[PDB]
Design a protein around this ligand. Structure first.
Ligand SMILES: CCCCCCCCCCCCCCCCCC(=O)OC[C@H](COP(=O)([O-])OCC(O)COP(=O)([O-])OC[C@@H](COC(=O)CCCCCCCCCCCCCCCCC)OC(=O)CCCCCCCCCCCCCCCCC)OC(=O)CCCCCCCCCCCCCCCCC
Ligand SMILES: CCCCCCCCCCCCCCCCCC(=O)OC[C@H](COP(=O)([O-])OCC[N+](C)(C)C)OC(=O)CCCCCCCCCCCCCCCCC
Ligand SMILES: CCCCCCCCCCCCCCCCCC(=O)OC[C@H](COP(=O)([O-])OCC[N+](C)(C)C)OC(=O)CCCCCCCCCCCCCCCCC
Ligand SMILES: CCCCCCCCCCCCCCCCCC(=O)OC[C@H](COP(=O)(O)OCCN)OC(=O)CCCCCCCCCCCCCCCCC
Ligand code: SF4
Ligand code: SF4
Ligand code: SF4
Ligand code: SF4
Ligand code: SF4
Ligand SMILES: [Zn+2]
Lengths: 178, 114, 114, 100, 360, 45, 145, 112, 207, 94, 125
């Protein structure tokens, strides 16, 4: 079905009353006083803004931000260098170089993320079979140097040891959906 | 053998268009060094024109020559107008790339490349 | 019935006198298709179409019933299509599409996957 | 929510209509932010029996495209004219609001 | 100060998305579509998903289709807010922008609660949908929809019966229907000239046959008609959101075929089959059969199209993307004839123009 | 346990308004012109 | 194959074997195909590899601790389609999609065994055989791999 | 709201103190960026915004992309994201404020 | 009836096969290999000389009012000597249908242009020339669109590298955005993903 | 295991440290190198063996769908003990 | 009408590449060998055309692998061989063609494993 937006049904009915009304629309700007009144109404409403550093925007557990490399509750490193977080990374941001650890364990000697190539898509954390790399809540990690945004294993593990108290909760909230 | 043409029955009728294009470029260079304030002399601009022409003198297929004439007319359009800036024009000169050594022993001193 | 002061399409006038312009255009198509050869298919199919639509015009004089019977939208769209089919008939008279296939392709041309 | 009942009146008059009911902001009529856990359901093909992937494969039910008038082979292209489909039936004018 | 010729030199958001897509998989290539038209994100990935589904001979389930059409209409309201308010900024009226970008922030909260990204949510996948929407979200969409009518009424009160807006949009950008068709326009640029056409009606792709709405059409091809058409498209998208909320059936959200769509996170931790399938899906892909398609949807700008070409491999061989805005910009020079710099500015704003899809 | 999927409630949702509502308001125009001319004549006197 | 497990029972788990410094046996995943005993008996001529028991409890390998240490022993790593036995030098290093593959030859012996050298970001990760029937009949020595 | 902080746009680069590279920088649009940065009158600052501008981003390996605005304009502050939440861009702007707060110019002039 | 697979009809297939016979027998001087796919998308393949007549036919014929150009693509297949497969997606709006006309080309076998039929083809032909190197006869402008002005190369050709042959950066020595050759700090990592198993026997190529 | 080298740099769990003559120590001037102090080798060594009764058991992380895939470990050997591939926990039977 | 062009089809003046990667470069036309890990052979059957490899080096910051050539990740596919020679001769690349390696057919017998006289009598099962 369709409908017309600017098609007059039919014309040619005018008397002195309608002429007066149109001539008073003109010469008084009556359809402009309505815009003035609208903007005046908006002057007396509560503004939608927030004192940002002190009160902030609402986010959800699914929110995907800064990355982190997680650990088990035993402190054991949770990644195993299965090397598919970089298989699927559609920006080729992730590199891995892996070896046995001298304990006899599949673990990494390298986990880099050029966060200037990352598109923050979540594919790595929904591809990891062990919930090792995640995309956490921190969106406030701006820098004054390009080289700082090129991460490695130690920075990601620092993030994990920092944000575990948040990431564990976000995961607890969002699983049963993923 | 037994192929279709484009704009050229033969190679001489293509060299005709080639010379028309060389002419347009020769007559355009003094206006391009003036309109957008290039920092070169008209002599070496026209030498660059002849260089980028003799970069393709080995060719004998008329069709390739016609396509090169077409692309030259495109670049000439872009240069007659100021759709392209001083950056693009001075791109031709390679004013920052060190000369590729055309000698064996230099290549051997730096790099595994031939 | 009436004159339908507003055809909904923009740039399209109204043609106060339909049932004549269509006769003109379809008769012209029929008279030009006689120059096509018999074995051609465009001749046959366009003759079928124009005869059916001419019969529709001859039958129904009401513009609305004519539209609903002649599924081409408003009558002015139908007239535009008749003019454009006529233009096509002339162009096809010049092109000779009915000839056999010219220069069948190489074998691995439409084969996919490769 | 706090507009002292006379500024509420001013804004509702200057606007033209009650907006204390339809506000731009959100106070307590929103879905809260910590919730119960779900139990997401499970689609068919979890039948546990009478479910073989050869029977409900779609990615294999395709064929290479059918062919008419291949110049390679010897295929041949009274006969009534044809359309690619019947003409698209005209749209009907709306009933809730035809002339805005 | 009046225009005799327009030569748009686009090429400044040309990256090479099509070549990179040829080099990526079908899942790796999805966020490019979020990033092509970057104010109507979920619709682009909806188109891509539909095309890959057609190549796979697979359909998603009811719930996924319903939430897909829901978020498609949400994208329509996003981009129509964007277009209308940017057009107004260009013409001089700046308050609708600030009034409606709050509503866009609420919509981004919907995106960020469903996905975890405000804008570039890779939520519409080929096999249905990634993640089921959380508890307590349809209530919020309802609470938004019940008041968005008032918001759009405020904007319409400001600048529909106005004189400056009318004098500045009316008899501007006039297009004949034949010119629109020949130049290649689509969507609103057709319906403003009065061409009854909408793929949501003619070529319905998810559930649009199952939901009712009206298509606004204009009688003059001026900017004013195809402004009111956008406003009424926003209202009708709201009408459809009502229905999509009132019926959102239970069930799986992605295709229950683990050779195309990945399994549940717990199913890939007790079963070996589903782990194999996780592995191959997230490292190699799913090997769509050879063939090709052209699939088109009503993007909020017009006919967003994708011509995919394939092979047994897990990657695409060619993926051209039709951009509504390409043909509009081609027709810019025609539409600006006897007009001025300001009217040309308004004509740019009227096309609902965005260059990630044009240059791409 | 049984399923839970954020379906709508039992009884659908309320009716969402979508039609345009710009309220016709204002005086007649005869009244406005009378006020104007009356102010004008009083001012002249 | 199907895409779902209708298996709701506990798996098994098999004792692993310490052959040697090359072949890394993880036999919780052997599919009992006997493609290895046949190689060791018919091509390497060793006959120190078999099957112990029957049922699910059949365990491929030796009944004892024995270094399966032959000049054609690393070929089982290519033979075993499953990763029940892999190589220890390549252990946990790379993955096949990462690897570029250049068809080269061998220089250890004068046999001319055709070979594939697999790289990963400018390094060398592993060696593999090529197929040539006049030389290197899908097999290569343990040195050159 | 940015104007809350005294941060309002101006269309001309000469009435501007900072430029925010909010998008992908191509080989065709880099001369224009540099002309604009040049025309900006010093003191002037740059904020690279997004992965496409910090580095090359999702279009790093393409033929028509410069792999960072670092190569064309000197960046003071990098904001990551695809897109970066406006919350995050705001954080980066206040971080640029903090950077300006510790410039110590007249100090070093006295110490010349 | 099966939910996971896509539903299937036959009337569209039959309609499009009929219309394919229609075009095939009405336009034999040019037409090759009409075909209709599993998904019902009609696809006519054409000799490059037949472009204007076929497109004018499908635009202006009464039973085929394909008067809207949706796309105009090209597809590089280095194997076949005529590389570039050129595609014309159209729609009717009278019959609610689409069609696809195809031709072929090469680096030195150009094609007549279509602005005389579909003005929408202007910028698409420009894009095709820029991306693949197909020259179009009697075109008004036919300059680049998308590539930089000083740009040598047709990028969407399969033999063109993804990263290109030149890279840009600003230099203080000359105060310009110079173009140096290409030198990346991280090589693009090509992945060998294709599986060594016949997934689809229906497309099995025999030797 | 954050023992240092004689060049003063911390050494990582991937024993990485730059040589003395390696010029790439510049970048840590007026700066430091991020290294994680909590080594997983020593930590998972600081974890006792979970004795069991059966010869075959399973291991996930402990959350179920929040750990790792279920794997089974044999415990017939007595000289050594079982070990998980994903985690590094150990098991034994009496 | 037609033309009689004799000389070799040459396109290098159109392709927009430097003289370097045209003349210096070498090309390998081949069918790739099957991965001896997998018993599948579908990754064969298509003639490919790779380029010579060039210097990669450790990036001094992180250790990534860098390049100075763009033809590194370059691979094309051809249904046949003459197509590949044609494409290479056309684009001006010197090529080396490795012929098609096909496995010998072989006479299998499950009964030879249980012979009375032969050495095929396998000691296992
Ligand atoms: C012109 C009239 C004078 C302004 C006035 O007094 O009207 C206030 C009052 C505000 O009404 P409102 O918009 O509903 O206030 C919102 C909530 O009350 C807001 O609730 P709240 O939680 O934010 O608490 C508000 C609290 C906040 O406490 C404060 O007073 C803020 C600090 C005062 C300095 C700012 O109290 C006030 O706002 C008192 C404001 C009184 C006016 C102060 C005039 C000083 C301006 C500086 C002159 C130099 O307006 C009226 O009732 C009369 C309106 C007449 C218009 C015709
Ligand atoms: C704080 C300051 C408050 C001032 C009021 C601001 C406007 C509020 C909105 C009022 C509104 O909505 O009106 C709607 C209505 C809109 O009416 P309408 O658009 O529905 O038209 C209805 C039918 N006809 C056409 C016949 C009238 O307008 C009015 O009520 C008044 C319009 C006449 C205005 C004439 C003012 C001319 C100004 C010059 C005279 C001298 C002024 C003295 C200045 C000192
Ligand atoms: C009521 C509001 C209206 C106010 C309007 C009038 C503005 C009043 C401004 C008062 C502050 C005066 C300080 C301005 C300094 C600006 C110049 C500057 O900071 O550059 C560093 C300057 C220059 O230092 P410099 O010599 O080291 O500069 C180095 C040059 N380069 C960059 C090439 C290496 O420092 C000064 O000169 C400070 C002394 C000037 C005081 C004059 C008064
Ligand atoms: C005793 C007998 C004799 C008595 C004699 C007196 C008889 C009565 C005289 C009444 C005349 C009143 C003056 C009217 C002048 C305006 C004339 C007019 O028609 O409007 C002009 C303009 C036209 O609008 P448009 O719809 O396009 O119609 C034109 C079609 N030709 O419309 C416009 O101008 C609008 C564009 C300007 C918008 C600017 C924003 C205005 C905002 C309103 C603020 C009002 C505040 C005024 C306060 C003043 C205090 C000093
Ligand atoms: S997917 Fe997870 S376990 Fe595998 S390499 Fe990446 S982070 Fe490590
Ligand atoms: S979020 Fe996406 S782009 Fe970023 S590292 Fe993970 S997979 Fe790569
Ligand atoms: S080849 Fe591998 S899978 Fe087959 S029996 Fe030997 S160890 Fe088991
Ligand atoms: S990759 Fe193959 S062999 Fe290895 S665990 Fe998985 S299914 Fe078993
Ligand atoms: S949102 Fe992402 S794709 Fe878009 S410009 Fe920013 S970084 Fe690039
Ligand atoms: Zn474990």
């Amino acid at each position: 079905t369709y409908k017309y937006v600017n098609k007059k049904e039919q014309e040619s009915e005018v008397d002195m009353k309608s002429a007066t009304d149109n001539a008073a629309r003109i010469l008084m700007w009556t359809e402009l006083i309505r815009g003035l009144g609208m903007t005046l109404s908006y002057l007396f409403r509560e503004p939608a803004t927030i004192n940002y550093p002190f009160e902030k925007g609402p986010l959800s557990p699914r929110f995907r931000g800064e990355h982190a490399l997680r650990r088990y509750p035993s402190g054991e490193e949770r990644c195993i260098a299965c090397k598919l977080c970089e298989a699927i990374c559609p920006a080729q941001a992730i590199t891995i170089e892996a070896e046995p650890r001298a304990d006899g364990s599949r673990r990494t000697t390298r986990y880099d993320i050029d966060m200037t190539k990352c598109i923050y898509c979540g594919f790595c954390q929904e591809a990891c079979p062990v919930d090792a790399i995640v995309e956490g809540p921190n969106f406030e990690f701006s820098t004054e140097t390009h080289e700082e945004l090129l991460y490695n294993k130690e920075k990601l593990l620092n993030n994990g040891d920092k944000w575990e108290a948040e990431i564990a909760a976000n995961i607890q909230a969002d699983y049963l959906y993923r | 053998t037994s192929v279709k043409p484009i704009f050229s029955r033969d190679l001489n009728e293509a060299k005709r268009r080639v010379r028309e294009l060389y002419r347009a470029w020769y007559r355009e260079v003094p206006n391009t060094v003036h309109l957008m304030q290039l920092d070169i002399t008209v002599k070496q601009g026209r030498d660059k024109v002849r260089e980028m022409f003799m970069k393709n003198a080995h060719v004998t297929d008329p069709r390739v020559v016609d396509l090169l004439v077409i692309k030259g007319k495109m670049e000439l359009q872009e240069t007659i107008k100021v759709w392209k800036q001083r950056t693009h024009v001075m791109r031709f000169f390679h004013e920052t790339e060190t000369p590729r050594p055309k000698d064996f022993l230099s290549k051997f001193y730096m790099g595994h490349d031939p | 019935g009436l004159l339908k002061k507003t055809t909904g399409l923009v740039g399209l006038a109204v043609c106060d006198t339909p049932h004549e312009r269509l006769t003109i255009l379809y008769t012209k198509t029929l008279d030009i298709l006689k120059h096509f050869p018999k074995h051609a298919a465009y001749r046959k199919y366009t003759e079928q179409i124009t005869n059916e639509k001419l019969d529709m015009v001859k039958a129904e004089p009401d513009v609305k019933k004519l539209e609903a019977l002649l599924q081409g939208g408003e009558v002015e769209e139908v007239i535009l299509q008749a003019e454009k089919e006529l233009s096509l008939a002339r162009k096809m008279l010049k092109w000779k599409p009915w000839e056999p296939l010219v220069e069948e392709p190489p074998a691995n041309q439409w084969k996919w996957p490769i | 929510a706090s507009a002292t009942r006379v500024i509420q009146k001013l804004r509702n008059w200057a606007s033209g209509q009650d907006l204390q009911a339809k506000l731009q902001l959100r106070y307590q009529e929103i879905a809260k932010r910590t919730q119960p856990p779900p139990k997401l359901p499970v689609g068919p093909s979890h039948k546990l029996s009478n479910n073989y992937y050869c029977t409900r494969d779609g990615r294999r039910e395709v064929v290479p495209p059918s062919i008419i008038m291949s110049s390679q082979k010897a295929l041949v292209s009274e006969k009534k004219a044809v359309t690619p489909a019947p003409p698209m039936k005209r749209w009907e004018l709306s009933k809730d609001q035809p002339y805005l | 100060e009046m225009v005799r010729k327009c030569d748009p030199h686009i090429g400044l958001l040309h990256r090479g998305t099509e070549k990179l897509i040829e080099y990526k998989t079908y899942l790796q290539a999805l966020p490019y579509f979020d990033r092509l038209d970057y104010v109507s994100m979920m619709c682009n990935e909806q188109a891509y998903s539909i095309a890959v589904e057609k190549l796979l001979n697979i359909q998603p389930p009811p719930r996924a289709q319903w939430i897909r059409v829901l978020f498609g209409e949400i994208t329509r309201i996003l981009n129509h807010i964007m277009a209308v308010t940017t057009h107004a900024l260009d013409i001089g009226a700046m308050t609708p922008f600030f009034w409606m970008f709050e509503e866009r922030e609420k919509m981004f909260e919907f995106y960020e609660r469903v996905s975890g990204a405000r804008m570039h949510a890779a939520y519409i996948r080929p096999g249905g949908v990634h993640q089921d929407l959380p508890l307590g979200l349809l209530d919020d969409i309802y609470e938004f929809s019940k008041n968005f009518s008032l918001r759009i009424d405020e904007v319409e009160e400001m600048l529909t019966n106005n004189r400056i807006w009318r004098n500045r949009t009316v008899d501007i950008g006039v297009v004949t229907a034949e010119d629109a068709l020949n130049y290649g326009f689509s969507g609103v640029m057709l319906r403003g000239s009065g061409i009854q056409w909408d793929l949501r009606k003619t070529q319905p792709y998810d559930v649009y046959d199952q939901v009712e709405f009206d298509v606004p059409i204009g009688s003059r091809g001026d900017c004013y008609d195809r402004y009111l058409c956008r406003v009424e498209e926003m209202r009708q998208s709201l009408r459809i959101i009502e229905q999509c909320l009132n019926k959102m059936p239970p069930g799986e959200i992605k295709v229950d075929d683990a050779k195309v769509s990945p399994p549940k996170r717990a199913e890939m931790k007790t079963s070996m089959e589903s782990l194999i399938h996780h592995f191959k899906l997230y490292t190699e892909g799913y090997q769509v059969p050879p063939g090709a398609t052209y699939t088109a949807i009503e993007a909020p700008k017009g006919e967003f199209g994708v011509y995919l070409v394939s092979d047994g491999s897990s990657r695409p061989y060619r993926c051209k993307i039709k951009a509504p805005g390409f043909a509009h910009l081609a027709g810019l020079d025609k539409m600006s004839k006897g007009h001025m710099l300001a009217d040309v500015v308004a004509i740019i704003g009227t096309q609902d123009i965005v260059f990630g899809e044009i240059d791409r | 346990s049984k399923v839970k999927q954020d379906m709508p409630p039992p009884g659908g949702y309320g009716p969402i308004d979508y039609k345009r509502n710009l309220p016709r308001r204002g005086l007649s125009g005869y009244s406005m012109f009378a006020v104007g001319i009356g102010a004008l004549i009083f001012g002249y006197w | 194959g199907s895409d779902r497990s209708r298996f709701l029972e506990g798996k098994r788990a098999v004792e692993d074997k310490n052959i040697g410094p090359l072949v890394k046996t993880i036999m919780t995943r052997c599919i009992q195909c006997t493609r290895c005993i046949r190689f060791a008996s018919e091509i390497a001529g060793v006959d120190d590899l078999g099957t112990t028991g029957r049922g699910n409890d059949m365990q491929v390998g030796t009944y004892i601790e024995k270094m399966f240490m032959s000049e054609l022993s690393g070929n089982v790593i290519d033979i075993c389609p499953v990763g029940a036995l892999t190589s220890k030098p390549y252990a946990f290093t790379a993955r096949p999609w990462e690897t570029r593959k250049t068809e080269s030859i061998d220089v250890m012996d004068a046999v001319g065994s055709n070979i594939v050298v697999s790289t990963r970001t400018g390094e060398v990760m592993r060696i593999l055989p090529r197929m040539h029937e006049d030389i290197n009949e899908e097999w290569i020595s343990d040195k050159t791999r | 709201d940015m104007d809350r902080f005294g941060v309002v746009f101006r269309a001309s680069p000469r009435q501007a103190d900072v430029m925010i590279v909010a998008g992908t920088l191509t080989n065709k649009m880099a001369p224009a960026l540099r002309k604009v940065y040049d025309q900006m009158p010093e003191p002037r600052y740059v904020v690279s915004m997004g992965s496409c501008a910090n580095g090359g981003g999702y279009y790093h390996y393409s033929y028509s992309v410069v792999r960072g605005c670092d190569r064309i304009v000197p960046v003071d502050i990098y904001v990551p994201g695809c897109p970066p939440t406006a919350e995050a861009l705001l954080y980066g702007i206040l971080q640029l404020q903090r950077k300006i707060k510790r410039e110590q110019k007249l100090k070093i002039w006295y110490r010349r | 009836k099966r939910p996971t697979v896509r539903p299937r009809s036959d009337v569209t297939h039959k309609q499009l096969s009929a219309f394919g016979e229609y075009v095939a027998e009405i336009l034999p001087k040019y037409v090759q290999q009409v075909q209709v796919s599993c998904l019902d998308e009609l696809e006519i393949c054409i000799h490059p000389d037949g472009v204007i007549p076929t497109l004018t036919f499908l635009r202006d014929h009464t039973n085929a009012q394909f008067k809207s150009l949706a796309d105009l693509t090209a597809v590089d297949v280095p194997t076949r000597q005529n590389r570039f497969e050129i595609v014309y997606n159209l729609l009717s709006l009278r019959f609610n249908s689409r069609i696809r006309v195809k031709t072929y080309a090469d680096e030195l076998t150009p094609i007549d242009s279509i602005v005389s039929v579909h003005i929408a083809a202007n910028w698409y032909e420009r894009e095709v020339w820029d991306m693949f190197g197909v020259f179009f006869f009697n075109h008004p402008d036919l300059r680049r669109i998308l590539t930089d002005y000083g740009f040598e190369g047709h990028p969407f050709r399969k033999d063109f590298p993804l990263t290109g042959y030149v890279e840009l950066r600003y230099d203080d020595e000359v105060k310009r955005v110079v173009a140096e050759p290409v030198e990346l700090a991280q090589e693009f990592r090509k992945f060998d993903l294709n599986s060594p198993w016949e997934a689809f026997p229906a497309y099995r190529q025999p030797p | 295991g954050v023992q240092v080298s004689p060049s003063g740099e911390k050494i990582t769990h991937t024993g990485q440290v730059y040589d003395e003559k390696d010029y790439r120590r510049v970048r840590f001037v007026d700066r430091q190198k991020e290294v994680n102090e909590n080594f997983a080798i020593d930590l998972i060594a600081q974890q006792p063996v979970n004795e069991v009764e059966h010869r075959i058991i399973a291991c996930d992380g402990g959350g179920g769908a929040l750990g790792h895939p279920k794997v089974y470990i044999n415990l017939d050997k007595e000289t050594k003990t079982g070990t998980c591939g994903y985690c590094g926990l150990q098991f034994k039977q009496h | 009408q037609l033309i009689t062009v004799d000389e070799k089809l040459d396109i290098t003046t159109l392709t927009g590449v430097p003289e370097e990667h045209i003349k210096t470069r070498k090309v390998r036309i081949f069918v790739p060998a099957r991965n001896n890990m997998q018993s599948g052979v579908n990754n064969t059957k298509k003639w490919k055309m790779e380029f010579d490899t060039r210097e990669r080096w450790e990036n001094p910051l992180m250790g990534w692998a860098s390049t100075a050539d763009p033809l590194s990740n370059m691979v094309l596919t051809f249904s046949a061989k003459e197509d590949a020679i044609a494409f290479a001769e056309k684009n001006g690349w010197s090529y080396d063609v490795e012929e098609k390696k096909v496995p010998k057919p072989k006479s299998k017998s499950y009964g030879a494993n249980f012979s009375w006289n032969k050495r095929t009598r396998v000691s296992t099962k």
